[model samples]
Structures are given as C-alpha cells and as structure tokens.
Target: MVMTVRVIAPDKTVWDAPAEEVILPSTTGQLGILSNHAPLLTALETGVMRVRQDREWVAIALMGGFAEVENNEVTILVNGAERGDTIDLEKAKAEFAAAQAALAQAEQGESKQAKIQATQAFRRARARLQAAGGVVEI
Candidate 1:
C-alpha cells in the first residue's frame, strides 16, 4: 500500500518518505506506479515528479537523472530537485519565460552545443516553474 521513495542529488537527499503512488518523468514519457510496481531502472528526463500521499499529490521539480524501482522502493538519483515551497514562484515564472525565449533559437539551430545549453536551461526553468505551481507547456 506504500513504498519507500528516496530522492537524491549530488550533495544531499531531497526527500525520503512513504508514498502511495508516484509519477516519474522518464525519458520516454510519464511513468506512473503504485505500491506493487515491478523492478527496473529507467532514465529520467527533466520534468515534474509527482508523489501521491493520502489524498494529496505533492509535486517536485526534477532535473535530469535516473530512477530505480525494486521491492516496493524507489530510488531517484537526479541532478536537482525541489519542492514548491522551496522556490520563489514569481522568480521561477520569470526564469521560465526567459529560458523558453532563449530555447526557441536553439530549437531552430543545428549546433549541438547551443542546443544542449539551451535545453539544460529550459529544463531548469521549467522544473522551478512547475514546482512553484506553474504549468509548463513542454
């Protein structure tokens, strides 16, 4: 009925708690799981991670990384993650605007480096915005 979920970045653990369900932003798409999920490791994309707890869904923005699931446990290793209260909503919205504006050119261009940089920036901005209760169209 519950799973132990751990979320970590390079320097610290972001969250360690019991979750009734979770939705991951896998590289392919959104992956949803309940308590009795099967075992596997999946690559994560930069997006919002949603954890279901007792009739509520808590959202955390996740930067790129990976996730492993086994024995009713989930281990998420990510570049970055944060809860809504941890970020300034207005600032996050502004950052998302700027990043998306910059990303337009990168999406049109063919240079790999530029694309990578823009993509990363976009992801970061999107994550923060989502964490702050903003909807991101990506």
Candidate 2:
C-alpha cells in the first residue's frame, strides 16, 4: 500500500504524491513514516525531508513548521520548503553571504537580539543553499 504525502508551504505546494515512505526533520530528530504507520504529529525543524516513492528518493529543504500523519495520509505544513531542482543557486549564495556578514557584525556588538536575527537569517540562507546543492560555510 502507498500513502499520500502532501507538502505545503506559504508560497506554494512543494509536493503532493503517493509515496512508499516519507522522512522528515522533526524537533526530536528525523522521523520516517510508512504506510499504515501510527498516527503522529510533530513540530518540524530546519533541515531536509526525504520522500521515497518505490526506488526513487526526492529531497526537499524545509525551514520549519509542523507535520501531521493520519489515515495513511501525511501533510506537512512548513514555513518554507523547496525542491532541489527549483532552487536558484546564485540568489541563495548571495543571501548566504549577506547573512554571514550580518552575523559577523552582530557578533562584534554582541547584542542578543541581533545575534538571534542573524542566526535565523544564516539558517534560512543555509537551508536555501543546501537546497541548491551549494555548500554553506559555518
């Protein structure tokens, strides 16, 4: 049996299809769901989600949000999610560079709020870069 997994983000629907398994980045860690699995709900984390349909594996970068699984249906409501091929590598790299500079400036002043904002920006950029198959320097 197969399960229908739908991934939705604010801007668009990232994916909707039948899959053999779905792996998500949850707050507790990575969680894998298969057909007939127990119903579950969990907060998502910033990372990649792997969807397996038969022998094919597709990866998506998720910013964060929540996931729900019930009745052999999985729905992911994410703040942001992107497929690997859809990512714009040049834009992602530029954003990463800007975030790094902001982080460095924030570190100099040592302001907690600035640091937090910078970190979030960094994570966002990193996630986008990863989706684009680019490396993000810590």
Candidate 3:
C-alpha cells in the first residue's frame, strides 16, 4: 500500500507525497511507519529520518518536533529539516566545528544560551552529516 507523507518545517515543506515506509525520530525512540500503521502522535527527537520510496532511500535531517500517522498518511512537523543528499561534507564539517567552538567558548561561562544553542547545532549537524553518508559516530 502506498502511504502519503508530508514533512513540514517552518520555512517550507521538506517533502510531500507518497512513500513506501518511513523511519521516524520519535521522542522515546525510533518508530517505523508503513502503510496501514496504527494511528499515532509522537514527540520527535533531533536526528536522521529515512523514507523508503522504491529503489532507494531518502534521508532527512529532522530537528525537534512532533509526528502523526493515520489512515495511511504520515505528517512530520519539525522546527527544521534538510535533505541528506543535499548536505555538503565540507559545509557540514565547518558547521560542526563551529558548533564545537561555540560550545567550548560557552563552557567557559560565556553565555548559557550559547552553550545550549551550540549543543543543539552540533547534534543537528551531526545528524545531517551521518545521513549524508559522512563518517560520523552517532
């Protein structure tokens, strides 16, 4: 059975249309979605999400939010998201390095918000890197 999937971010719709299956970043853990999935509402974590179309897998970097599945339709609402294959390795590395630097600086008690934001950025970048098939340790 084909399932309709929509991934929404504040700035745009990351993806929309049919998918065979999806692996989500549910808050408790990973949740796999297939056609005829039980209805669900779940808090999402910041991580890599996957969608199996036909012959290939589409990887997505999803920031925190929520997800819903019902009647063969899946919807993901996240603060931010990006396609994995679109990530540039060099850019990912640069972003991660920048986050690390920010975190280090914040740990020195520069700014509490800075530390929190840096940590989130680091995780988001790592997820994207990993999804893009970069050598990143989860």
- The lDDT leader among the candidates is 3
* Residue 137 lDDT in candidate 2: 64
Q: Which stretches of candidate 2 lie over 4 Å from their true place?
A: 86-89, 101-121, 134-138
Error of 2 at 85 (Å): 2.7
> For residues 26-113, what per-residue lDDT tens digits would candidate 3 score against the true structure?
6557678887788887677677777888778866777677888887777788887767665666777777787877788777776657
Tell me how candidate 2 scores on lDDT. 0.73
Q: In candidate 3, which residue ranges exceed 4 Å CA deviation?
A: 113-117, 130-138
How many residue pairs clash in all the candidates, one count each? 0, 0, 0
Could you give candidate 2's per-residue lDDT for residues 32-112 as a string of tens digits?
888888788867766677889999887777666688887778878887766765456666667678777777866677444
Residue 11, candidate 3: how far off, in angstroms?
A: 1.8
Per-candidate TM vs. native?
Answer: 0.70, 0.72, 0.72
Clashing pairs in 2: none
Alpha carbon lDDT of each predicted model: 0.72, 0.73, 0.74
